[PDB]
Design a protein around this ligand. Structure first.
Ligand code: G7W
Ligand code: CL
Length: 255
């Protein structure tokens, strides 16, 4: 029902391949938000029309504080427009470049917010990803928000669990593996399986080979070792992560 004439456009927040993201403002309420413009050309060049169909109807019927909200959408027969929540503080990725690594307080809270978001997703029968730092945005108070970034703004091997790479079947447990890769990146400043080649990285993931720098504490080492298990069924539940000693002792956001 929306139309482009309903919005004022500000500066470009990101130019990508499929399109751009602009700062915008609904004319009636003066509400600030983000507007994605997707080119039907590039959508036509590839085959995602059905894939585009999916995400939208889902994200629409999806309301949670740690999940970027999608408000609406519309088209003009050459372009596709998405209306999203605007997240003023930017990307967790850029923060990690600025600070190098996070402290246990900051990390424990991020993990808490991610676990809550993921647990909501599971309840609505949904499995997301790859929750890479570049797909994690920040609200005005500093609170994390899962975007499921369109790449309108690594490799992606570093965040995939063993079962997904090797060709085997996978379930909700893939999210617990991601959570542990992320927890480690937050405290150390790089993912635990990073390497100069795709081959070595593969090898380290499938064989779960990684180590800690001295400064990582035992309660941290403990939670990460429990998420990073080759056998998916041996990975904890989201619920047990929220109640972990290291989490409860360092997180400022309640479960
Ligand atoms: C750069 C800055 C930091 N930035 N970026 C955002 C931002 C956050 C989320 C999105 N959402 C999407 O892109 C969704 C795309 C798709 O569902 C999709 C579906 C089917 C496809 F085939 C595809 C395709 F990619 F294959 F085409 C995509 C977009 C921008 C943002 C924000 N909301 N607030 C503040 N700053 C912000
Ligand atoms: Cl092993």
């Amino acid at each position: 029902q929306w139309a482009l004439e309903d919005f004022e456009i500000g500066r470009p927040l990101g130019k990508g391949k499929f399109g751009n993201v602009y700062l915008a403002r609904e004319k009636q309420s003066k509400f600030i938000l983000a507007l994605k413009v997707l080119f039907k050309a590039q959508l036509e060049k590839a085959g995602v029309e059905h894939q585009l169909r999916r995400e939208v109807e889902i994200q629409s019927h999806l309301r949670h504080p740690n999940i970027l909200r999608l408000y609406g959408y519309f088209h003009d027969a050459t372009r596709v427009y998405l209306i999203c929540e605007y997240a003023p503080l930017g990307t967790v990725y850029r923060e990690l470049q600025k600070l190098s690594k996070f402290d246990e307080q900051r990390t424990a809270t991020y993990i808490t917010e991610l676990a809550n978001a993921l647990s909501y997703c599971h309840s609505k029968r949904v499995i997301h990803r790859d929750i890479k730092p570049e797909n994690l945005l920040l609200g005005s108070a500093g609170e994390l928000k899962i975007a499921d970034f369109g790449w309108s703004v690594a490799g992606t091997l570093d965040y995939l669990p063993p079962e997904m790479i090797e060709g085997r079947m996978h379930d909700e447990k893939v999210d617990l593996w991601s959570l542990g890769v992320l927890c480690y990146e937050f405290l150390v400043g790089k993912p635990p399986f990073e390497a100069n080649t795709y081959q070595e990285t593969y090898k380290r993931i499938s064989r779960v080979e990684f180590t800690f720098p001295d400064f990582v504490t035992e309660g941290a080492r403990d939670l990460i070792s429990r998420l990073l298990k080759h056998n998916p069924s041996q990975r904890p539940m989201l619920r047990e992560v929220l109640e972990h000693p290291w989490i409860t002792a360092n997180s400022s956001k309640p479960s």
